[PDB]
Amino acid sequence: TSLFTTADHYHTPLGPDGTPHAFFEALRDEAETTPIGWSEAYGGHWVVAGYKEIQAVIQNTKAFSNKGVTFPRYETGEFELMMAGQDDPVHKKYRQLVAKPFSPEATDLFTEQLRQSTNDLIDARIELGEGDAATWLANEIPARLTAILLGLPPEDGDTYRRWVWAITHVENPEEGAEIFAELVAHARTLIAERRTNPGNDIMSRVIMSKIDGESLSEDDLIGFFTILLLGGIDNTARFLSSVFWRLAWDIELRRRLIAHPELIPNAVDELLRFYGPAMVGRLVTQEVTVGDITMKPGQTAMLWFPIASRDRSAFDSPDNIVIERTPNRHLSLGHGIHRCLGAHLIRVEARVAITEFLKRIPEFSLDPNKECEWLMGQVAGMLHVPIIFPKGKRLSE
Ligand code: HEM
Ligand SMILES: CC1(C)O[C@]2(C)CC[C@H]1CC2
């Protein structure tokens, strides 16, 4: 038998711990012999699991197009995913408009706002001694940051989460499309308001931008709105939820981050390696051979980053969280021309989130009377992480 034959990122076997990591480890073992395999799922597609094979695919933009970045395709109506769903020269043209606001220098400026936000959020339940770390904290830190980036009201997270759920998980196609159409309606309204009253946020920036002397179409602006929403509300939230779950039970990891705060940045990169939630697809546009496998135009290759990030030929002791690991050339944020636009921002965000969480609540554990839940998909991670902790005090009454 082979684990590739029915591999499906939306239907990964979960182990007794509640994660797909036993399955991922078994697939990684198989990938040492067969780094690329055919899956019968989604009508047939290639699963790319080896580190060097993923790198070969991701670097070869001539044969592998980002038109297949989401597979099955996200529900975004007739709109394509801005930057992520495009090839050069179109892709580069748009990324250039937002490179600066996402640079390390610029994103470092969010640090104190995030620190304050994390503490204000913790205040909401610290006196209760219990809460769902995903719903209460991991979801809300990036939701509020995303609202700030987009110039939206930070308190409307539930609305934003409902849009993103429709894009990424709603089964019924008509329901999904209708809810994405609600996002579009809200985006158009936002865009019109900012045309006359622009702020300092990223939507205002692109709305006032030009390419070769021309303003962006409303459709292109809706694309920008949608991709930034996804990175925050889906990718970041699921990553942080998985991290908080791990910290809840792994008392050895936890004590080391508290004793050595200087290691938190390196530990965040190791946690990205280990709990990085994303996979991406590529559409094959010309016949190409990778390793032993020849792929044909029209086929899709899924890049199983979590498996490659556990490849023994790329990482010593890959199944262990080695917080002092360096270098750490993991693929959780991609590589090459499409490498995560939000990479520096989310590294800052994670550092702060972990730091303040462990400062405020050094002692906690998983709730024995409530269930954790892992969400499978193209972005996969914990969705519910009930924890308990000694009742504490608010910083701000
Ligand atoms: C832990 C959180 C996140 C993870 C793990 C993640 C992961 C990734 C990955 C793997 C890619 C590569 C896409 C590919 O190769 O096709 C990517 C691209 C991208 N991400 Fe992130 N992402 C995260 C958060 C964010 C955030 C917060 C934002 C924006 C505020 C964002 C915006 C983007 C954009 C625009 C691209 C496309 C870049 C391009 O095509 O040049 N992401 N992300
Ligand atoms: C999964 C991944 C990497 O996240 C977004 C934000 C970028 C590319 C794809 C789809 C949406």
Swiss-Prot record:
Pathway recorded for this protein: Terpene metabolism; 1,8-cineol degradation
EC number(s) stated in the UniProt entry for this protein: 1.14.14.133
Cofactor dependence: heme
Binding site for substrate: 235
Record site feature (Controls regioselective substrate oxidation), residues: 235
Domain of life: Bacteria
Gene3D superfamilies: Cytochrome P450
CDD domains: P450cin-like
Catalytic activity, as annotated: 1,8-cineole + reduced [flavodoxin] + O2 = 2-endo-hydroxy-1,8-cineole + oxidized [flavodoxin] + H2O + H(+)
GO MF entry, a single one: heme binding
Keyword entries, A-Z: Heme, Iron, Metal-binding, Monooxygenase, Oxidoreductase
Membrane-spanning parts: none
Other facts: It lacks the conserved threonine believed to be involved in dioxygen activation and instead contains an asparagine at position 242. It is the first isolated P450 using the flavoprotein cindoxin (CinC) as its natural redox partner.
Task of the protein: Involved in the degradation of cineol (eucalyptol). Catalyzes the initial hydroxylation of cineole exclusively at the pro-R carbon to give the (S)-6beta-hydroxycineole. Cineole is the natural substrate of CinA.
Family to which the UniProt record says this protein belongs: Belongs to the cytochrome P450 family.
Subunit architecture: Homodimer.
The protein's name in its UniProt record: 1,8-cineole 2-endo-monooxygenase
Taxonomic source organism: Citrobacter braakii
Lineage of producing organism: Bacteria, Pseudomonadati, Pseudomonadota, Gammaproteobacteria, Enterobacterales
